[PDB]
Point group: D3
Amino acid sequence: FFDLPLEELKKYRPERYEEKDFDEFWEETLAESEKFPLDPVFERMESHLKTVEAYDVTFSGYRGQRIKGWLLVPKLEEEKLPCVVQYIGYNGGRGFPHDWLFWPSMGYICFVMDTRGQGSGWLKGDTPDYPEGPVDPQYPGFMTRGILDPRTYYYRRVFTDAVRAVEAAASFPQVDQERIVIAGGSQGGGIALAVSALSKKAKALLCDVPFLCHFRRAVQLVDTHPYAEITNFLKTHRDKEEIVFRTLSYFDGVNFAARAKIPALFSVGLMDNICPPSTVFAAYNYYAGPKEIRIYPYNNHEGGGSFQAVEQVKFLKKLFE
Amino acid sequence: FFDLPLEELKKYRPERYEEKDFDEFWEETLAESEKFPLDPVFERMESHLKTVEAYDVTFSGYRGQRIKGWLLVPKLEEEKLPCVVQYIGYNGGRGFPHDWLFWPSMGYICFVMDTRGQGSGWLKGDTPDYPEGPVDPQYPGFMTRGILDPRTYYYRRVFTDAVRAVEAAASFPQVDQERIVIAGGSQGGGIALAVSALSKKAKALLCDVPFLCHFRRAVQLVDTHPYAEITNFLKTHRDKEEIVFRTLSYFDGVNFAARAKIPALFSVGLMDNICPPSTVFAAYNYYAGPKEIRIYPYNNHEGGGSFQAVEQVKFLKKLFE
Amino acid sequence: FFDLPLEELKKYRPERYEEKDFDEFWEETLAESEKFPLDPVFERMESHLKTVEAYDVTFSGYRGQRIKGWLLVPKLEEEKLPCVVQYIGYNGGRGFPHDWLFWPSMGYICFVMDTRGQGSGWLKGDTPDYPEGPVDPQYPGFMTRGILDPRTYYYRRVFTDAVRAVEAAASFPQVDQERIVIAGGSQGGGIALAVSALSKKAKALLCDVPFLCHFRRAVQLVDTHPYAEITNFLKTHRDKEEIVFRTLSYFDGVNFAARAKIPALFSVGLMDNICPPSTVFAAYNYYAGPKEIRIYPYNNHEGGGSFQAVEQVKFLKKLFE
Amino acid sequence: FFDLPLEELKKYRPERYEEKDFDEFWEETLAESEKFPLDPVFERMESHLKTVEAYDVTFSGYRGQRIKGWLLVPKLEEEKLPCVVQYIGYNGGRGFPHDWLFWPSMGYICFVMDTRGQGSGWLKGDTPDYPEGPVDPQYPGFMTRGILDPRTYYYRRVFTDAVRAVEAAASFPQVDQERIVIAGGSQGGGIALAVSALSKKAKALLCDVPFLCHFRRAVQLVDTHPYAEITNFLKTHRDKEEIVFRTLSYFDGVNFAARAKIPALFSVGLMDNICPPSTVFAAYNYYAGPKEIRIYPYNNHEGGGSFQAVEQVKFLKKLFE
Amino acid sequence: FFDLPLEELKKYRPERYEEKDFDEFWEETLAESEKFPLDPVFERMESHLKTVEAYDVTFSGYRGQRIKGWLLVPKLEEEKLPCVVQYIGYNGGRGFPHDWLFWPSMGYICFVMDTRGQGSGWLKGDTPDYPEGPVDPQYPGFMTRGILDPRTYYYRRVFTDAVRAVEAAASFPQVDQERIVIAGGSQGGGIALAVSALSKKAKALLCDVPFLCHFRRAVQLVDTHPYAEITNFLKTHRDKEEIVFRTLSYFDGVNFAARAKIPALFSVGLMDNICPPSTVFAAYNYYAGPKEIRIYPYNNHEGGGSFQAVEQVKFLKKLFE
Amino acid sequence: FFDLPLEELKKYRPERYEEKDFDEFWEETLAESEKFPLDPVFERMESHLKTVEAYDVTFSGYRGQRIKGWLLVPKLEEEKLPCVVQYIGYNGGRGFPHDWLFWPSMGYICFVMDTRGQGSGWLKGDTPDYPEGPVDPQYPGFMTRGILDPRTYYYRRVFTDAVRAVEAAASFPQVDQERIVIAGGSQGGGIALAVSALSKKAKALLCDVPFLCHFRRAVQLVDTHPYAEITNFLKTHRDKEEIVFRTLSYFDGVNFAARAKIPALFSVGLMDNICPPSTVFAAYNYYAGPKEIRIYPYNNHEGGGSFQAVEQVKFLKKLFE
Ligand SMILES: [Ca+2]
Ligand SMILES: [Ca+2]
Ligand SMILES: [Ca+2]
Ligand SMILES: [Ca+2]
Ligand SMILES: [Ca+2]
Ligand SMILES: [Ca+2]
Ligand SMILES: [Ca+2]
Ligand SMILES: [Ca+2]
């Protein structure tokens, strides 16, 4: 228990910081990227999978840039199926279709979005990043890539891909558009939280142990990666502190949470030192839609694991009845 | 690269040590346990799973003792299906049925055997151990539980459970008995390797990054857990070295490997410091059936991960054609 | 200094939790074990020791189960001598007679109780555990052995052995029954604290850096072993939290302290991260007999070491004059 | 002493691996970059420095891309001065002019080249990287940036900048072109070693504890950063091993050493676990110009420190007399 | 952020502890050492340095004992120059003259004082210690050397050397005595802080990340070296606590700060775990002369690095105008 | 198993290095110290000990300097008793008389020699060091104290004290001079090994896990303390390597071993990374008296513990029969 006591966590509502043009920044970003056609492509694959049909996905994300994915369709006769749009944790990518069998096995179509430029830490990826011209001085990783301007920042492109990925999923004929879920843990949870505010097609949020939340507090509290990337950049670039935190304000899950309206199930680990409970609770507490949180007092960053997976299936069945 | 070079590993065939009553010990063990009825029990569960039917399993393992499991049957039109008997890694247990979706998704029935007394480290379990009367002084864990006599040793009970689990899988009416596979990684791999020699029903072996191999070498090469449990016991019980290694000889995967005849696919990580490459290659090199090994030079204990999963599905398809 | 400031520690009296049948549970436990004869056996042994006479001890502890020990009698004229009953720290056992020369050299008979099932970490042991039938799923070690029911819990058996060990000590003809001391550090301190409430024969308590106190706090404060065994179990068995802490309440030194009436000398290390100062002070502050505590501000789990040994000798001399 | 014995190091000449188009790859790379004007710009700065004149440098490196630097001119009578072109270690950048006062104080003009895209770990930098279009999946850092093709690889651009930096230094009027030295440690040593083979203007090499050498051995010997970036990439991209090491062959300091003809002073630490001794000695032993090595048996990556600085000034004074 | 919040650090003024004879102790110490002639010697050396003239220094410090140093004079027209007296961090020594080029390069004469008995950790030294007869039992290092009596304590001798060093600097003919600066970081900062109170010749203080401050707090806050030397001594010498802290009170930077009158620039790293922020702020807040502090929220013991060096040059320029 | 295989250890006989005046260095040292009277003082203490009489010891060691100790005399009928002269491990000191009850309890008078200047790490001490004038630059600790000249080296004083301590023990009236044993582990083992060659009064050697052996190999093999003190000094003082090892050659237990003639029991731990097996076996193999070694394959620096204590008591009983 390195963070605030649970009774304080449940009341933790730090003063939010954002620029006055937060909404217009996102409006412009999305409008610019919408000028290129989504052009979603689903290509049925040869696979040894027998209970699922697998597709190779390509769609246009940030500024027409082509993003990879998987679509896994369980072989069921229902003609319209509910759908989970799955975002991936830091240093991961889309891997193989058989890495994402949970949701299909529970009767949901699953759209797995590949993460631009990552895919080299714990699960392979196939999608590149394409920067806004010059790749400024940065600390190794994705957290400080373009951090000196919100227009050049890595997560502007990732979040835009992620909103577009729900439009791609929704284009698939067998997808029931009234039951589109956005889902992620860690980095995937911060991605999903941004999508919960920016997407018009999402109907429910699953947000586990979310990353990209309350950056200023995260960086003071823990020296774990990946938050430590920001701290390290700041240790060197000692003149750049105000600019760093200004840029990060546009991407902070606490500021998106305050704008989100769809129902959400969160999870938190009270001993999580990658995504500290205070940062997760700041985002939960500001979350503006109907919401629940499952709290795991003795867990680190693994959170609720398979127990939470049961919670999520039960939560969505009840929500959509 | 902390172990022997790969050219040497490929030739590594250390002198084997076993007592002259090795076979006799195992014949008596199995014969005594076969006097109790198997009494396999499959009970269909209420589940949110849609592509698979899930059953709660109970069967009689060592000396009539009741062992839990899961059976996952993918919903397919084929009347008899191939089957994978899945053994679980150290400190794990059967978990939830949804933790084992890989093989059913590939069209295989999957029998997951719960590990007596464990189930408390990384995945929950439901099966107790039942000792041979007194539970001797031991180091924390399962590696030194009953280690002063092979008749009282923890893994005598686990290995008997595991042989009996293949008989329980085979009793299921929808299982094709010409296509029963035994599978495991780490502790699971060492259990499987025992079964490959002691079972008459297994038709193929999948053996990844195997544990319980070449104990004398393991304990001198690495200070990682769980092999360190034996070293720590020996650090205290300085008079018991000969007895410890005598007992461990009856449970050594290298001595089972020498007697196994069924086809096998192994995997090894050359930077694996939990299951060192020399202990895995010692088992592989003595393995007496038709065999292949996939070698992952830059991987630690994670081995080939999802890449190896693809290898296994291809391996078994071609074997059974 | 990772815990509460000293001025707060001295006032620390957290709300106690126990079940309404705490006393009955212990009355029944002891009554059931008293139905078996103590049958204490003292066997003079061949030894190179010249200033002390050494005996091999056997006595009936929990449910008639036979527990080993040593009795060390200093060679002194005096026909009745004072006696220290010594309990041992985690992963230790009775070792050799010469491991326990301190009290005999100070003119006290010393009864060393071996710890069932341990004796494999830092000092050898010779006494097995005997479980209540099935040995449930557990994390490696003794802390979570049978933890799902106080009737099956490992320390129910250890505490009962420990109460019976005083009765065995008292049976020795040369032991002065008006000067029987119970003594331990760490796990030994926690055992001794339980005995201070449950024994009718004990006349003084020495309790150093006590373990098995204020479990709920211990497990939120430190990630060291052995308290980490409980946390790790809870990380996996996420449905079992209330049950684990209910069981643990029956074995909590804070709850025994509240009932103990004999004079006591405690010790505490303010930088102790094995047995945190708040857990020790919770026990000390509830302690209901005449009491003193020696506080070592700069020491970790070593506590006062040989300085505390001098304090204990002086304490007892004054108490018994 | 984790590496080969010193007697073996001094004879260590492993089989070199390079593609048949190594030389044409570099000829083409240089020729393409030479089609843009160098356009070197030296802009005198306001500084508190009194013994040195400082200039802000900009010059065109890889494909006309503008690279920053510093030029420090000591205030001396002599109309033409000798010059050190200084390359910077991993995660560093040009910092402030006062971070480079050693060589000016010894009477040498010093050209400090900023490292594109880094400058955020231990010293600030001001130069971006500019990729060849898509930024492929990569592990955090510079080592695997573009690694699937030598044409896209990060160090193609760094090495081309570094060759052009000598041309920029040479264009300064007070620089004696017969006494241009190239210098670096760690990453700067590997950059300088590439320049020793590719530049026509360099007259002497100072190469301390060099990085970017014998990649295949580095990655199997040590788990330190930055070599561990490559290993971590390979752990995930298990199908890309042959491509990774093919690409890296074009950038290996051993293959450049084999072509270099100018006099060199090397240094090595025999306990260096960042740049292991065998990788440094491979480069030194293949180095084809007149050469010396200072060996520091008890030093890690710090090498000879200020002792080696003394050696360098003595070595150059003698060389140029 | 392991220490008090910044808003609390800015007000942190703990109760000071010192003996009534604090001033008398220092008066006597200085008076006794002043009875030996300073006998400062400056010996021009052969050097490859071209912009600086380098001198070997010898002067009489504590009790006539002969202390080494360097004097670096920048080659400038000006007939009187300002001067920095530079103290060195823990385990350092005077090194080579070229290790100290910063201040000469900025137009200042630089007197580098070697630290008696150290010079063996990160930079070589040439000055021995000379104890007050018997060298008492101590923990490895300098922090507990003679710690049982302030007259025998290591830093009595160091602080006296350091006061005498300003008198030696001031005896150099080209030194402007109106512009003598005392400077240090870490141990150097603590030394400089003592000199700021004890010297009559110093005109400004540069005090970075100061060590030797608020010992009682330092020792309970962090387990890093060198403050851990004191804690380890106290762990053993459990009877010596009051004596240790009594001695240390005579050498505490907080107590000297309260007496210093000259202008000062401090720096602090809020993540500094060697010299914690609270101990540095305690000294800064009690500092009795005109003062400023540069605060580096994201830096550990490196502090402001080269950024702070720029601040120091600008601070002194403005001060001396 | 980090060191040479046991078959190689048993034959390991590295080329010895010593100066031609090794023997004369020691003859002169002893001769000089013998010019001061031994002046042994035994003062009986008030103690709570009942089976042992305890004396405060003072005797003249190196150059008449007064060294503390304890003498423990077991209360027995025999008029002359055998005696163990006990040397203490690194950072230890004589502690309290009750810290040394083992030998007395086995019927041996025990002379415990306090270690000059230490006594601050794990057990308190009371004896200061007295240096040969100036205390040269050193790394924290005792290993590099005076290391630039054998005349000034710390262990010259310690080894002289130790030879004198046997003479002081022999002066006690109840000591049987035909049964005087010299005993130590770690640093104590290295001290005892020197005394085995330099004393004429010692009749047997107990040498456990010896330190101060084969320095050049120790320093290459391990980075543990205390050998790392020498390495760290060498890392800084890069010009002083030949001098450091020349000095150490006069104090190397391998060189004393080659001259010792009395019967000896050694012990070694094959996983000992403080005192590596090769350094212990180098000393063992050159030992020129009748000898045995107890080998503990799975033990680190704890060696054989209480098992070895049993071996020692058996060894001596048989020797003296
Ligand atoms: Ca707005
Ligand atoms: Ca047989
Ligand atoms: Ca009751
Ligand atoms: Ca017996
Ligand atoms: Ca070619
Ligand atoms: Ca006064
Ligand atoms: Ca001189
Ligand atoms: Ca001679």
